[PDB]
Symmetry: C2
Subunit: 148 residues, 2 copies
Amino acid sequence: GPLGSLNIIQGALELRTKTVEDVMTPLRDCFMISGDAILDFATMSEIMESGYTRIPVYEGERCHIVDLLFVKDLAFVDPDDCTPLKTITKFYSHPLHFVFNDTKLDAMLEEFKKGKSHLAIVQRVNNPFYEVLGIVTLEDVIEEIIKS
Amino acid sequence: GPLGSLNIIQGALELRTKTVEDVMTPLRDCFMISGDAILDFATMSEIMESGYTRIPVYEGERCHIVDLLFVKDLAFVDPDDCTPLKTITKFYSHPLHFVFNDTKLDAMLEEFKKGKSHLAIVQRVNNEFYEVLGIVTLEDVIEEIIKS
């Protein structure tokens, strides 16, 4: 009981020192879908079976994330139509947020609390190109607070 | 910034005094589905559009919650088949957790951390039978911690 609330307090202190790179999901392990996808029955089945609700969309390379698909966006998609996925990502255009790996978790929580979004992409400056490393969710940050 | 870390500490103290009744969702405002439901195209669409991933299932009265439907269970459900919902709830049998309204938030967070489930039903001892008032999610508890 109180020992658990103590760990919460310790996590609220760790937030000012931990970066989003520490708690993110690496790109090699992120469940994503290609923009070339056709929303037939088989494709939508993997989206739902994955358990995720916010799935990054990439074009060509897995590091080129261009859109964000929500599971609620498939509410009016009939698999018999073979609707291309790019059509639905254009229609809803859910905001896609990018952040640097050096971002601290307290600033990350402040950015997540202000907006409805719960997902952000971790990218690092390569040395003159942008290098995407992974994604970090709001649920990823809150784990650090309550973890013992 | 640092002021936000204060609210976590204040919430980390307040949770030991707040009951699940204060932060729950009342049954009159809970998105639920009847066990008689047929998983045709129209029904599956309403589940997805709601944005929820864990939807309580009731039999007869809305206060008689008997099962819990996840969105991922529809991965292999063809709307043309008209598969009854009870078939899927029997197949997976996701655990349904009930708690008393007098339960404090510190004890509630401990129960959610131990199990994979993120949903619980708030019931109160009626004196004049079991009186169900609403449901409380893990998202309700962590909000009180981080709330300013």
